[PDB]
PDB file of C-alpha atoms and ligand atoms in Angstrom:
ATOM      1  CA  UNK R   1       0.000   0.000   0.000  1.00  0.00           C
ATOM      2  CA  UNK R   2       1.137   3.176   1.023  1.00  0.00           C
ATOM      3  CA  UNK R   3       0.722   4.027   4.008  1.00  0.00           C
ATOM      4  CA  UNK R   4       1.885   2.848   7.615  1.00  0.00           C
ATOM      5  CA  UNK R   5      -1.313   2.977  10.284  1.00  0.00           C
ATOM      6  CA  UNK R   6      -0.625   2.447  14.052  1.00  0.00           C
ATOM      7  CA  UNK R   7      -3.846   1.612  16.126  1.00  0.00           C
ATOM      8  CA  UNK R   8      -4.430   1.699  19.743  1.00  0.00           C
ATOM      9  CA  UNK R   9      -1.395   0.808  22.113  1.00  0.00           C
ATOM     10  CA  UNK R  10      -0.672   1.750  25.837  1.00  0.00           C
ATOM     11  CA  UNK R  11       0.509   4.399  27.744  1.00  0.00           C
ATOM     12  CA  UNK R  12      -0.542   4.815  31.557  1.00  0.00           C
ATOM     13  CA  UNK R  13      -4.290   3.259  29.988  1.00  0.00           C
ATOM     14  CA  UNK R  14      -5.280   1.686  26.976  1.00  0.00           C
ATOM     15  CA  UNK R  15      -5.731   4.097  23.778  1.00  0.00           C
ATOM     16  CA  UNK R  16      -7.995   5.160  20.489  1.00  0.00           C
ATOM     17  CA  UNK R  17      -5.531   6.653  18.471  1.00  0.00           C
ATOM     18  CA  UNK R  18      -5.135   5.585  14.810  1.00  0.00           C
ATOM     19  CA  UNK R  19      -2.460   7.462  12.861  1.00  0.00           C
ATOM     20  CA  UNK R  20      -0.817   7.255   9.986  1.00  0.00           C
ATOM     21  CA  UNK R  21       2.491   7.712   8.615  1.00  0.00           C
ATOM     22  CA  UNK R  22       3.485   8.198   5.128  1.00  0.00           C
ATOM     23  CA  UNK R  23       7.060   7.157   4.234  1.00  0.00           C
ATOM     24  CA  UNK R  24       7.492   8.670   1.337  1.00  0.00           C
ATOM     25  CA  UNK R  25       6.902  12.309   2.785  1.00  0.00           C
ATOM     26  CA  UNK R  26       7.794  12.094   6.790  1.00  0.00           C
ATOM     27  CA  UNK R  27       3.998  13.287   7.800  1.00  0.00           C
ATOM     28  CA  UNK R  28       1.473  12.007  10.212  1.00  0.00           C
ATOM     29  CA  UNK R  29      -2.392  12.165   9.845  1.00  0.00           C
ATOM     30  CA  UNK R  30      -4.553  11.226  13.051  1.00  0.00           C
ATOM     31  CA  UNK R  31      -7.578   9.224  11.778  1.00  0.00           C
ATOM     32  CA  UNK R  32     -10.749   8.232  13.356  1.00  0.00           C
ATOM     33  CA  UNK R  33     -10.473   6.838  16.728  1.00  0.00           C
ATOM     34  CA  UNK R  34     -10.872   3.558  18.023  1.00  0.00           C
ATOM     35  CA  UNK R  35     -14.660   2.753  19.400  1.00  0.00           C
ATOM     36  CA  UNK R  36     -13.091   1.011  22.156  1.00  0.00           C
ATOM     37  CA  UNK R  37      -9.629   1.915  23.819  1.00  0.00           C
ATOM     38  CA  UNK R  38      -7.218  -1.166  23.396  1.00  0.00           C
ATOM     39  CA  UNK R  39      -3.740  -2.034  23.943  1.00  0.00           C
ATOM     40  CA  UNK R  40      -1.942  -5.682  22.846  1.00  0.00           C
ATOM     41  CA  UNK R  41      -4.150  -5.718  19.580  1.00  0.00           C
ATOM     42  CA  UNK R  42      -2.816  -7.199  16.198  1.00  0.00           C
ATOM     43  CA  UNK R  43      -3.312  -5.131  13.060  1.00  0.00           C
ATOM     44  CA  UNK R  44      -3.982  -6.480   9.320  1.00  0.00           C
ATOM     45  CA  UNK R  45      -5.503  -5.789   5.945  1.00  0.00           C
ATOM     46  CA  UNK R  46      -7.472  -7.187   3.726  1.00  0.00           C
ATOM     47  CA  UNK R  47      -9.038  -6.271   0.590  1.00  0.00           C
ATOM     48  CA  UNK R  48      -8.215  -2.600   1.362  1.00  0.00           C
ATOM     49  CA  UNK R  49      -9.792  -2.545   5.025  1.00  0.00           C
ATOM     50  CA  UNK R  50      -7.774  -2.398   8.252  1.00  0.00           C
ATOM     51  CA  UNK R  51      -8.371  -4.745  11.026  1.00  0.00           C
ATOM     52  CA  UNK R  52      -8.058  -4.528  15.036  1.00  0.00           C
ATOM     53  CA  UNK R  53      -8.370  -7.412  16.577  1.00  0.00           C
ATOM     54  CA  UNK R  54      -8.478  -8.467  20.019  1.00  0.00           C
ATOM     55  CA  UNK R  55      -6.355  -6.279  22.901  1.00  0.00           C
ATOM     56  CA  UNK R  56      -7.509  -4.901  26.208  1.00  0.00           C
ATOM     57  CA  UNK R  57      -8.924  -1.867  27.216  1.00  0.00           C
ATOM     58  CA  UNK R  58      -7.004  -1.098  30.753  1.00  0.00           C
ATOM     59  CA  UNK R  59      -8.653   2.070  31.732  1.00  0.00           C
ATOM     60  CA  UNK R  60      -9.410   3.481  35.216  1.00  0.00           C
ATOM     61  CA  UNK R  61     -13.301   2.260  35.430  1.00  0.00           C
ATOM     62  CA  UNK R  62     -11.669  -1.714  35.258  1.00  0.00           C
ATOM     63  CA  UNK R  63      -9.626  -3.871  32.433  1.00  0.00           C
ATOM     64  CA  UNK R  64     -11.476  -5.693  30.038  1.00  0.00           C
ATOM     65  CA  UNK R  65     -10.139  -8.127  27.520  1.00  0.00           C
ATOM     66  CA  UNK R  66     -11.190  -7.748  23.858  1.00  0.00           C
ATOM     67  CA  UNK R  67     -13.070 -10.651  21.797  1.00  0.00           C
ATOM     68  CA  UNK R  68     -13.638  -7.675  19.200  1.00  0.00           C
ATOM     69  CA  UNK R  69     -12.836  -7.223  15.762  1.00  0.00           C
ATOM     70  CA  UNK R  70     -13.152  -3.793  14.112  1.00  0.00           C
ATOM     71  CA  UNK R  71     -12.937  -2.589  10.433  1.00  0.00           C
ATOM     72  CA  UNK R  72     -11.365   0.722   9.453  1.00  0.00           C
ATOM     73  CA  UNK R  73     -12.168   1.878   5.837  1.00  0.00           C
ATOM     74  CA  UNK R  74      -9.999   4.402   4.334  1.00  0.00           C
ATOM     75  CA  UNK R  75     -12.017   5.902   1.827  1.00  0.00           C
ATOM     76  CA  UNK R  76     -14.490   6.710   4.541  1.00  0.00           C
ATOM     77  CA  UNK R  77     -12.388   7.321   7.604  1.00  0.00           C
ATOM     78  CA  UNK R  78     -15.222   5.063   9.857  1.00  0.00           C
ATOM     79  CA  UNK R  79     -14.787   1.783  12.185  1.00  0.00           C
ATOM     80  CA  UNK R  80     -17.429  -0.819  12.290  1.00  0.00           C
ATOM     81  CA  UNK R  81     -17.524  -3.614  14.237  1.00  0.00           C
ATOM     82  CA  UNK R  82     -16.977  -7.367  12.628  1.00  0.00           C
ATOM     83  CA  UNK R  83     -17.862 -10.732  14.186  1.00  0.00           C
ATOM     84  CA  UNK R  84     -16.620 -11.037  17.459  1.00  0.00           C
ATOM     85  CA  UNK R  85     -14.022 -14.149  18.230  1.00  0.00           C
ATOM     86  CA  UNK R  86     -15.067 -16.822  20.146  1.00  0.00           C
ATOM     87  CA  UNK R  87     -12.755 -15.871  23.267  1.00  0.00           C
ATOM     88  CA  UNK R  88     -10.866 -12.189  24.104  1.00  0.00           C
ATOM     89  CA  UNK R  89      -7.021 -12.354  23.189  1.00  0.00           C
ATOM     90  CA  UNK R  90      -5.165  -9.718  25.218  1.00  0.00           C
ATOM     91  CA  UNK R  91      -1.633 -10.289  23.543  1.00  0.00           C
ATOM     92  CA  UNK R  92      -2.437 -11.876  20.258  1.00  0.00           C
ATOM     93  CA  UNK R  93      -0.820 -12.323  17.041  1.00  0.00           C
ATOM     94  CA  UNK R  94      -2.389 -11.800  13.654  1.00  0.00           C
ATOM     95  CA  UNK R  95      -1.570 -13.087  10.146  1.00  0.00           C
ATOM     96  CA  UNK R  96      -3.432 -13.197   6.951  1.00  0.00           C
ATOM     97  CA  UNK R  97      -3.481 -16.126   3.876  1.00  0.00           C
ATOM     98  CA  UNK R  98      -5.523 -16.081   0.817  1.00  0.00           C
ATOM     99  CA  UNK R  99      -7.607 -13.430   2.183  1.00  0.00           C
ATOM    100  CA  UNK R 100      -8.222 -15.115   5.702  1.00  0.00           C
ATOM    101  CA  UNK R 101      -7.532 -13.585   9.391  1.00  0.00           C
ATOM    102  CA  UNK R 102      -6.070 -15.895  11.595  1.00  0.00           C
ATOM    103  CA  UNK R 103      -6.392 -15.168  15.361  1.00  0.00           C
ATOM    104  CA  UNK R 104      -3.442 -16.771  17.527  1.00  0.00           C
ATOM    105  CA  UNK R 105      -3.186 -17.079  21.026  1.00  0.00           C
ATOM    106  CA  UNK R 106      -3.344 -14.209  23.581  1.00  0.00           C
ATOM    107  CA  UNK R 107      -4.799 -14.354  26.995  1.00  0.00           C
ATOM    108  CA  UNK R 108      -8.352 -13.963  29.078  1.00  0.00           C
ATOM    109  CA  UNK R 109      -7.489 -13.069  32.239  1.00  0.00           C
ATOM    110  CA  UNK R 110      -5.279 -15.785  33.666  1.00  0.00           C
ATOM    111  CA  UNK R 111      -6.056 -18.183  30.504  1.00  0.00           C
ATOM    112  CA  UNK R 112      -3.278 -18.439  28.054  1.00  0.00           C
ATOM    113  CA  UNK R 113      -4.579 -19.508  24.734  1.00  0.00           C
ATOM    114  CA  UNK R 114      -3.217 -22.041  22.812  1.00  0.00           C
ATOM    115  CA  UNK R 115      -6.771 -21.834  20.664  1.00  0.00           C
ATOM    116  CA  UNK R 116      -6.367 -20.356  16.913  1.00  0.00           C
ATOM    117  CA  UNK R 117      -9.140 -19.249  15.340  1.00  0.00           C
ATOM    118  CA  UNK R 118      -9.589 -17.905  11.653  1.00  0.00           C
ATOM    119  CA  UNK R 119     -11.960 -14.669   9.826  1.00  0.00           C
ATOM    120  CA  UNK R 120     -13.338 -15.124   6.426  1.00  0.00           C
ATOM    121  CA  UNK R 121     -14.295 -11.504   5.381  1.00  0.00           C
ATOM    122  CA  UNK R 122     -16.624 -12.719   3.077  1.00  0.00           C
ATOM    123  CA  UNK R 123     -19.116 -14.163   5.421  1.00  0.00           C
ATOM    124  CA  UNK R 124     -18.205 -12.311   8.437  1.00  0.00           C
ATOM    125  CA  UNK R 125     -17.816 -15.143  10.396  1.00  0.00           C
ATOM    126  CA  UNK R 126     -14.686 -17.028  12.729  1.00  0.00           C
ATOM    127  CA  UNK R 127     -13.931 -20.293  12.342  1.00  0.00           C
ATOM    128  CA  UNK R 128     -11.759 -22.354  15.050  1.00  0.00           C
ATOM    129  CA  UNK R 129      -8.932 -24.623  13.833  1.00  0.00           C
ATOM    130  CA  UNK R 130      -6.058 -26.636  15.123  1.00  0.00           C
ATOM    131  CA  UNK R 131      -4.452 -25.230  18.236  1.00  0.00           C
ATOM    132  CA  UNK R 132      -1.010 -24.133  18.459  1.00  0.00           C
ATOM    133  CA  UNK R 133       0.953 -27.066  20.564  1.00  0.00           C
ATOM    134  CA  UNK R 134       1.853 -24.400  23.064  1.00  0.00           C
ATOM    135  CA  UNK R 135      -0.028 -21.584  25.085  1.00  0.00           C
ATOM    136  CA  UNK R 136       1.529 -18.679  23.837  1.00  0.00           C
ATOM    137  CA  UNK R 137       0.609 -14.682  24.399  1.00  0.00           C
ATOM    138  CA  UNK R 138       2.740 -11.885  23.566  1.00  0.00           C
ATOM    139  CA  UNK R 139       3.479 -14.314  20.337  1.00  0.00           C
ATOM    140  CA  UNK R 140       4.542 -12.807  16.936  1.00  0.00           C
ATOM    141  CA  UNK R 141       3.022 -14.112  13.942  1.00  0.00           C
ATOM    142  CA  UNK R 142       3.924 -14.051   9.770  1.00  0.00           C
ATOM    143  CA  UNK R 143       3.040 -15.623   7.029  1.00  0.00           C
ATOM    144  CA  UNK R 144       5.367 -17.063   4.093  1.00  0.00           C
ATOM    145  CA  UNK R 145       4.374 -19.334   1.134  1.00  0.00           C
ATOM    146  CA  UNK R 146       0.871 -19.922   2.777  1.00  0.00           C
ATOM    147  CA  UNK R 147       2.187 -20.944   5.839  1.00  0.00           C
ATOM    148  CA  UNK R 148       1.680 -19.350   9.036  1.00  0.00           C
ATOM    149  CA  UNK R 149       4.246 -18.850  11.909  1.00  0.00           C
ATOM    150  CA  UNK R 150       3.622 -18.345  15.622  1.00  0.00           C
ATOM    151  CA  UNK R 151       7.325 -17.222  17.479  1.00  0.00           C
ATOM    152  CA  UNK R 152       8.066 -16.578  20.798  1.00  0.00           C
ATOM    153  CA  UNK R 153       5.726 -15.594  23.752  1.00  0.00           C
ATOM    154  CA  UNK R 154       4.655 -16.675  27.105  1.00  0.00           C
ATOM    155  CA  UNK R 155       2.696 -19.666  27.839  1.00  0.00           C
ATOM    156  CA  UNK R 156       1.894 -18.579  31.761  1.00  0.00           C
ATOM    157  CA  UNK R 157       5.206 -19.984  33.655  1.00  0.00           C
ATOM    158  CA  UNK R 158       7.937 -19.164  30.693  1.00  0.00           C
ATOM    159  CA  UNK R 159       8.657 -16.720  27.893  1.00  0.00           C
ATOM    160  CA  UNK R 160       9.618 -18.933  25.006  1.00  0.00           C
ATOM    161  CA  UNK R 161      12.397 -19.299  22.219  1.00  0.00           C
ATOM    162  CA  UNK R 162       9.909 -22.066  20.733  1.00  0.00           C
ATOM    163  CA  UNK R 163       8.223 -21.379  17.527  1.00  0.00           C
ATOM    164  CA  UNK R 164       5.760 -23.360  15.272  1.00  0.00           C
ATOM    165  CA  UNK R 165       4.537 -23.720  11.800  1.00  0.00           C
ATOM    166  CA  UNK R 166       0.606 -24.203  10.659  1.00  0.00           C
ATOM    167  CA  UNK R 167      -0.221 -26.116   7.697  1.00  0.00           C
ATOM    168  CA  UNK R 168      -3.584 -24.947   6.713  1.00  0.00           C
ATOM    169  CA  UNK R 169      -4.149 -27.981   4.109  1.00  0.00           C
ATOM    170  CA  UNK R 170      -3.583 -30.409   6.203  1.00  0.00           C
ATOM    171  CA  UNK R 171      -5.022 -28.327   9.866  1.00  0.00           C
ATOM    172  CA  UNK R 172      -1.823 -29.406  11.457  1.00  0.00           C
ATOM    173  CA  UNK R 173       0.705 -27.323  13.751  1.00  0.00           C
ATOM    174  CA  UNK R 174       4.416 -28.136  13.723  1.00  0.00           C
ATOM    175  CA  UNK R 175       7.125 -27.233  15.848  1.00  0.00           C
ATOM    176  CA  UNK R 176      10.181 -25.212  13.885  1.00  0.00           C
ATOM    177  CA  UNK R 177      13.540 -24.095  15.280  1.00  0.00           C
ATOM    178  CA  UNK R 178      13.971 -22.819  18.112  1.00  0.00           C
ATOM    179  CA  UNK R 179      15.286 -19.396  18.476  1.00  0.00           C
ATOM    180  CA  UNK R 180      18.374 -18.847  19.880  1.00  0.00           C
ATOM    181  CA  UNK R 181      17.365 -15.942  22.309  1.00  0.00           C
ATOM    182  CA  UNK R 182      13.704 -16.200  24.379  1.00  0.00           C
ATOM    183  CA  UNK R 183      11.628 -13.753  23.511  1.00  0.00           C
ATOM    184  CA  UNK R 184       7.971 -12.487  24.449  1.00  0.00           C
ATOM    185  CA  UNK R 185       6.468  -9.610  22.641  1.00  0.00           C
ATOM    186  CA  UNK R 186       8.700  -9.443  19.634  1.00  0.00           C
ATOM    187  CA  UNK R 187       8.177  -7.973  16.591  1.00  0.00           C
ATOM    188  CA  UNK R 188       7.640 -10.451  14.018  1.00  0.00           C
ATOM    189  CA  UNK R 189       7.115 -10.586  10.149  1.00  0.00           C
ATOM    190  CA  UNK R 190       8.504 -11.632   6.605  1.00  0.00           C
ATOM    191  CA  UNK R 191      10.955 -10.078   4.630  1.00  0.00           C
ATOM    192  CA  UNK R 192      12.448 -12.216   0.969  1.00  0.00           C
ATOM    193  CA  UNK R 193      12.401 -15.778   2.360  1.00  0.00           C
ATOM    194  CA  UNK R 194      12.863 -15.215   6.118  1.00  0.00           C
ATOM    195  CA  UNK R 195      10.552 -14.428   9.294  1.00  0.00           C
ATOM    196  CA  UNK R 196      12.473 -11.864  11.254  1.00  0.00           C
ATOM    197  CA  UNK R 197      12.391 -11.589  15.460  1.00  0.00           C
ATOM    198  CA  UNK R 198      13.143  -8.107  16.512  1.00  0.00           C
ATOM    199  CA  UNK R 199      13.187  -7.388  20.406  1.00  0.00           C
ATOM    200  CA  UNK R 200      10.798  -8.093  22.590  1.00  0.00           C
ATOM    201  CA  UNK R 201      11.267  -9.360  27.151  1.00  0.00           C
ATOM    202  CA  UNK R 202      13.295 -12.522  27.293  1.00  0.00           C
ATOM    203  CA  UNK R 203      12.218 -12.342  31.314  1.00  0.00           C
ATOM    204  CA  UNK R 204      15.309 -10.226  32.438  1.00  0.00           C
ATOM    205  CA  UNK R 205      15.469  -6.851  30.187  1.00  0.00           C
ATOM    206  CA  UNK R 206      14.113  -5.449  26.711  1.00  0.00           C
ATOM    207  CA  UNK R 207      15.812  -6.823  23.570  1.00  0.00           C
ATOM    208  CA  UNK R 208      17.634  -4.964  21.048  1.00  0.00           C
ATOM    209  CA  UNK R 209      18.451  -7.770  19.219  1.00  0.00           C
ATOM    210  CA  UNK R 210      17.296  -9.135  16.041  1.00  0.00           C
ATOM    211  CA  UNK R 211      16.799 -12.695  14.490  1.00  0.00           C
ATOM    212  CA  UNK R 212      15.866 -14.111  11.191  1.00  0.00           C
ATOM    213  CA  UNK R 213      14.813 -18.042  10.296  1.00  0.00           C
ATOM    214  CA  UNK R 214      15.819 -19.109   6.945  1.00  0.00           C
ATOM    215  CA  UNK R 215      12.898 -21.303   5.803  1.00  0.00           C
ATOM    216  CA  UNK R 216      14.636 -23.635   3.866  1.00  0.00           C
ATOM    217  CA  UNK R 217      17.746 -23.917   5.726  1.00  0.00           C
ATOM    218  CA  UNK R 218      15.510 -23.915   9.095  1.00  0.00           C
ATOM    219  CA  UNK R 219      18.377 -22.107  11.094  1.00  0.00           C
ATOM    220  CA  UNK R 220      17.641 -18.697  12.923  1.00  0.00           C
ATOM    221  CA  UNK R 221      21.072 -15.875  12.391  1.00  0.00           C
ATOM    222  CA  UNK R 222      21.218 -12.553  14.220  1.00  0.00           C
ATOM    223  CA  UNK R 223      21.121  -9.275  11.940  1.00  0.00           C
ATOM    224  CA  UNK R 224      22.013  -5.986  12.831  1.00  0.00           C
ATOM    225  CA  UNK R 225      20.306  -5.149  16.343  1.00  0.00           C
ATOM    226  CA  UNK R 226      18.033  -2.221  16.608  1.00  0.00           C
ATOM    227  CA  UNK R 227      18.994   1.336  18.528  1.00  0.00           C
ATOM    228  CA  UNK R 228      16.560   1.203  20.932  1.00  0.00           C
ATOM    229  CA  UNK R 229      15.738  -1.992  22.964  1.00  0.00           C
ATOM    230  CA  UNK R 230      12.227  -2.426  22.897  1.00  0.00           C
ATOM    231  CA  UNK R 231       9.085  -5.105  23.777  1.00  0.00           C
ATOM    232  CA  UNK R 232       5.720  -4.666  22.648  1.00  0.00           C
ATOM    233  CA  UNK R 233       6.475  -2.991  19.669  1.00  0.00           C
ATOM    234  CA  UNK R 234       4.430  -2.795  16.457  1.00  0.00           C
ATOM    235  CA  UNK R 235       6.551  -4.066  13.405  1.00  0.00           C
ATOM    236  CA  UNK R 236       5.378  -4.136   8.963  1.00  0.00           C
ATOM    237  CA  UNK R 237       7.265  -4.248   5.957  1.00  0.00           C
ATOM    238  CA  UNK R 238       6.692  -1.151   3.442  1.00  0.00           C
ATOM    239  CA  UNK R 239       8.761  -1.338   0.427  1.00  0.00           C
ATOM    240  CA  UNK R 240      11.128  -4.357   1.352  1.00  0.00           C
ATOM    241  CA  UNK R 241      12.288  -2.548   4.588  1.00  0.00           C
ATOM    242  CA  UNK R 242      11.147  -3.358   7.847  1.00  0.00           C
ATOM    243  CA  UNK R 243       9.812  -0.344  10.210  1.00  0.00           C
ATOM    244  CA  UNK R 244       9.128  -0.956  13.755  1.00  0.00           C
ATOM    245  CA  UNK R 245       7.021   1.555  16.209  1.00  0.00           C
ATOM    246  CA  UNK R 246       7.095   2.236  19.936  1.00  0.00           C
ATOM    247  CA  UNK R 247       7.484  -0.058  22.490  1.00  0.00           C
ATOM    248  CA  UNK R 248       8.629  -0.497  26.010  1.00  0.00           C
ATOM    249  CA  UNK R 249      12.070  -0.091  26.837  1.00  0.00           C
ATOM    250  CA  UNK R 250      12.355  -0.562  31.160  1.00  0.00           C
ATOM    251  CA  UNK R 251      12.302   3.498  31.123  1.00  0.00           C
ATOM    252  CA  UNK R 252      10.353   4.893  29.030  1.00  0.00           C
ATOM    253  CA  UNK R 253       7.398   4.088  26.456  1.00  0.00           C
ATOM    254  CA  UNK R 254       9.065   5.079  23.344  1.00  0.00           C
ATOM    255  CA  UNK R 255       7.870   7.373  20.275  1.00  0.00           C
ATOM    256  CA  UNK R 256      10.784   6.195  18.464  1.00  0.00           C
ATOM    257  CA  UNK R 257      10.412   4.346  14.521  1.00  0.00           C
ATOM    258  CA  UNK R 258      13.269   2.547  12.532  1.00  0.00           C
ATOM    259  CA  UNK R 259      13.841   0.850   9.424  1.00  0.00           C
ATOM    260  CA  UNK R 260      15.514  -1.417   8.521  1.00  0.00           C
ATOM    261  CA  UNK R 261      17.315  -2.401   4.888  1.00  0.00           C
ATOM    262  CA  UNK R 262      18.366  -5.957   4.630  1.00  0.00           C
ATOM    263  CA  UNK R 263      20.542  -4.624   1.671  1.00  0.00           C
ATOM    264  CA  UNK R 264      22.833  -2.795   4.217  1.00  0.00           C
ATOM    265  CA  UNK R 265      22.113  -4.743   7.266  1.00  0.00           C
ATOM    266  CA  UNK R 266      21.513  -1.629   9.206  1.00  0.00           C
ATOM    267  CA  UNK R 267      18.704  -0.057  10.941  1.00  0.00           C
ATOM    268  CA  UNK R 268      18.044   3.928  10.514  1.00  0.00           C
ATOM    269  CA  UNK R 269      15.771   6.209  13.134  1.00  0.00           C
ATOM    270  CA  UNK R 270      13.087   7.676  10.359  1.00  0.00           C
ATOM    271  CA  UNK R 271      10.226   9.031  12.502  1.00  0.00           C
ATOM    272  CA  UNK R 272       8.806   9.895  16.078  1.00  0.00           C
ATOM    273  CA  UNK R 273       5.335   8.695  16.652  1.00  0.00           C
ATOM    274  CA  UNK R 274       3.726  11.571  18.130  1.00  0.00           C
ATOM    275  CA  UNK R 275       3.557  10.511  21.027  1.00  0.00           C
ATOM    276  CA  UNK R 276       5.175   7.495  23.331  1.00  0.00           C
ATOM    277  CA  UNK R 277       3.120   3.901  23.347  1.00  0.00           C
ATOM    278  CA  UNK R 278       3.282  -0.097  23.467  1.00  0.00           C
ATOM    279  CA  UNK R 279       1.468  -2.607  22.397  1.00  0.00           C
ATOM    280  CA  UNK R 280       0.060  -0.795  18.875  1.00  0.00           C
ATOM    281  CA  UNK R 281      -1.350  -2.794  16.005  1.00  0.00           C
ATOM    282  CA  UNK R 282       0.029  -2.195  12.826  1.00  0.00           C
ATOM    283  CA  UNK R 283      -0.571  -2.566   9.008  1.00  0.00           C
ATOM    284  CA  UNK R 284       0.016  -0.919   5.756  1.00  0.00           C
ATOM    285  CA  UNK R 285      -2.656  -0.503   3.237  1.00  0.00           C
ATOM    286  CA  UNK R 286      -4.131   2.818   1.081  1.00  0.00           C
ATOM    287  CA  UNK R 287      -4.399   6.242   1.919  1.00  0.00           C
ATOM    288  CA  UNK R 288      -7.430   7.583   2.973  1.00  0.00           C
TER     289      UNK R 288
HETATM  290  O1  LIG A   1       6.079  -4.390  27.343  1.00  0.00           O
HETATM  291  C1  LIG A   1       5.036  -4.587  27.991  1.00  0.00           C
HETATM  292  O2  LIG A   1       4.714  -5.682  28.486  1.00  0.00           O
HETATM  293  C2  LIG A   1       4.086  -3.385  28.201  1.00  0.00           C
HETATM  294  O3  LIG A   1       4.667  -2.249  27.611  1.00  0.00           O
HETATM  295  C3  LIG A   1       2.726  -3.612  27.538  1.00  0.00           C
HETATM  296  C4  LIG A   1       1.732  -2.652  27.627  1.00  0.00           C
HETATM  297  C5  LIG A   1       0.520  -2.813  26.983  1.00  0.00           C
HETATM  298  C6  LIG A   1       0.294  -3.922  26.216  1.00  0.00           C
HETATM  299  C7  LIG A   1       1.269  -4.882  26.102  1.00  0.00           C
HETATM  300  C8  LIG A   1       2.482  -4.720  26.747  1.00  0.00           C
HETATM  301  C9  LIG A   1       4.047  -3.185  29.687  1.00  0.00           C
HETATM  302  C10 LIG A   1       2.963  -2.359  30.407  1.00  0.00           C
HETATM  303  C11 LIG A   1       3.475  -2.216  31.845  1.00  0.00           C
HETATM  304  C12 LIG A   1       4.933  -1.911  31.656  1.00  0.00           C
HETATM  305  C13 LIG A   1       5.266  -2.371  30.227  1.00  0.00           C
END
């Protein structure tokens, strides 16, 4: 698409903001709020349309976990609500194939989810399939060749290395690699042939460090590691570079966004988010 959007996050309570950032000029553009204040959502597209999808609203009058899943059109600038899951996933991750949502983990109070469930826009409705082999919130998700990828996480006692693969044909989850550093809350996607792992809690301190699996050599080799250590931050691709927003650091909830460029193996500060956050849901898709 063309633009980067950055919905809801986290600072001192659960937020509406959606902005946008356009790479190829340096500007923001607030948007339409949220309906609902959430933090730990997943953001996607498809077909044009934004999704949020699951989070929490933490906010003074009591937390609530979020079942919800809410469209954002561009051309209009309005959310509507879409089919609720069957569970809330504070924590989730989110990835997309052939036009389908799939829902991955998260948590419900003290449940950690090892339940999957999957969105066909089309009908509006979810669908559960095969569970993940491990309870995993704070997990990263990415697709590649019509696979899907769940990384990292915590499954209620331990923040993971572990990561697994989902077959869709044959409704069967696999374990992969292992990383070699545990991580819960990283930043997760695809870039060429390779599902990166950028930062994230490994149960000590914030990781600046960043991690790529080769899918057909099935070994994981550190990159370049980001400026800023950071968990909970929101990661896309735009253009064949990876950008990642805000985060948690130990300190401070950070504004700060870099990229990425594989070609260089170096990471670049390009923007400031206008204002600090964690826990954002992220996608690229048209400007509105
Ligand atoms: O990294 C983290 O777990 C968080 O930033 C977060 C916040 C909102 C949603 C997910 C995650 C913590 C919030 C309390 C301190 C940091």
């Amino acid at each position: 698409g063309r633009l980067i959007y950055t919905a809801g996050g986290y600072f001192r309570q659960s937020l509406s903001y959606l902005e946008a950032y356009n790479p190829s000029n340096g500007s923001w553009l607030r948007l339409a709020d949220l309906q609902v204040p959430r933090s730990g959502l997943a953001g996607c597209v498809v077909g044009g349309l934004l999704y949020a999808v699951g989070g929490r609203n933490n906010s003074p009058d009591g937390n609530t976990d979020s079942s919800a899943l809410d469209c954002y059109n561009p051309m209009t600038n309005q959310w509507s609500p879409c089919a609720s899951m069957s569970v809330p996933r504070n924590r989730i991750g989110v990835g997309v194939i052939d036009g389908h949502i799939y829902a991955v983990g998260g948590s419900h109070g003290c449940i950690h989810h090892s339940s999957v469930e999957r969105y066909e826009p089309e009908r509006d409705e979810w669908h559960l399939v095969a569970p993940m082999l491990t309870r995993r919130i704070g997990v990263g998700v990415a697709v590649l060749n019509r696979l899907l990828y769940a990384v990292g996480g915590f499954d209620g006692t331990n923040r993971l290395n572990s990561a697994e693969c989902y077959y869709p044909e044959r409704n069967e989850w696999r374990m992969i690699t292992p990383m070699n550093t545990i991580r819960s809350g990283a930043g997760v996607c695809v870039l060429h042939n390779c599902i990166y792992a950028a930062g994230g809690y490994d149960g000590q301190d914030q990781l600046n460090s960043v991690e790529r699996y080769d899918v057909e050599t099935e070994t994981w080799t550190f990159v370049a590691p980001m400026r800023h250590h950071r968990s909970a931050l929101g990661i896309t691709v735009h253009q064949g570079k990876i950008y990642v927003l805000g985060g948690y650091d130990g300190h401070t909830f950070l504004d700060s966004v870099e990229c990425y460029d594989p070609d260089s193996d170096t990471w670049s500060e390009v923007t400031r988010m206008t204002s600090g956050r964690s826990g954002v849901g992220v996608a690229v898709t048209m400007e509105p």
